[PDB]
Amino acid sequence: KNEISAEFSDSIADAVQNRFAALLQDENQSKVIAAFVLCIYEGEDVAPKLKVISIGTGTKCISGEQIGQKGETLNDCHGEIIACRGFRQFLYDELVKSLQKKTDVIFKSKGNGKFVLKPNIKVYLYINTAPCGDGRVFSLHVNKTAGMLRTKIENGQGTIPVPEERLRTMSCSDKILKWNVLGVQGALLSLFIEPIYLHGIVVGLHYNYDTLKRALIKRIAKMDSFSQPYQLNLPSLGHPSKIDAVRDTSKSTSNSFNWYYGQNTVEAVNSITGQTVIQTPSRLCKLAFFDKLRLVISLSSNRFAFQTYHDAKMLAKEYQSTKEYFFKALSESLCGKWIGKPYEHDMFGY
Ligand SMILES: O=P(O)(O)O[C@H]1[C@@H](OP(=O)(O)O)[C@@H](OP(=O)(O)O)[C@@H](OP(=O)(O)O)[C@@H](OP(=O)(O)O)[C@@H]1OP(=O)(O)O
Ligand SMILES: [Cl-]
Ligand SMILES: [Zn+2]
């Protein structure tokens, strides 16, 4: 089976609820809430400390219309993706600290140049509702569309199978499946740290163990032929007991909120524009990551030669080759072909 207990899922959901209330001024118009949660063991005999590292909300993404090409526009403002981006920023900040040789850090050195997450720290993903895409498809083991890659529709609201409307965004279920192959950290961070994999995933509304197992973990049921430190991650799946309530009333908001550890402030993003509500680039946009990367580069003792963001990502050779094998495994298993943006979106510099 491999299901988190109700008590522990409620523990995770409770901590997310408490942090959310501490950040947002009394008003709940957010429909999708996600978070990344650290579970920190002091010893393995006592209960762990739970620490909410990032929060995202949102239900929408950009049309090709508003997409910029300076990396100043958020492509995807679904709360789960926004939560991951914030967690990535956290990883960067922690990586800096480790490079400035601080002690209060989640990383230790691995004797290959690259940091590894301390083994007493476990990462959990929480979402108050099943992720869009395959994770909301309920089918028995006997099925057309079950298991397929899906793309987000009409600025986020809805997913449909990949073409088997120009260049679209993959569903949250497919992105989480990807994170369980390549880690949550992305190409760039993998230059400096070993892949960080989710230990567990806690899902509220529309939970079904078998659906989420297929969607997020065991979809290809092949892969293997993996090269350490990459593997098929098998996180446990959990469901909390109570939920804030479905509320499909009227319509969803275009606002997407984010917070992550070490920020004093909640940033509010217009999901239709991919930028802040004061027409500025988000602290989570590609360009903000690219700034962080060079910060990191200057504190590193290595040199890095790349013209663009795109080229920098291609430096992560282990990640990129596992990514390519993953995409092929999906196509071979008849899950469809991944739709990735064209390279020119990432061909910017600074
Ligand atoms: O693998 P990563 O380092 O995490 O880069 C990914 C990713 O991959 P590629 O670098 O392989 O293109 C996505 O791009 P596509 O799969 O669409 O090509 C992009 O997803 P979106 O285009 O849907 O935004 C995603 O960002 P997200 O957090 O939105 O999932 C993020 O790119 P960045 O970290 O560079 O933004
Ligand atoms: Cl929302
Ligand atoms: Zn989604």
From TrEMBL:
Chain residues that bind Zn(2+): H78, E80, C132, C172
All copies of domain A to I editase, residue ranges: 54-348
Binding residues annotated for 1D-myo-inositol hexakisphosphate, in chain numbering: N75, R85, R88, K175, K178, A187, K286, Y309, K313, Y319, K323, W338, K341
Protein name from the UniProt record: Double-stranded RNA-specific editase B2
Taxonomic placement: Eukaryota, Metazoa, Cnidaria, Hydrozoa, Hydroidolina
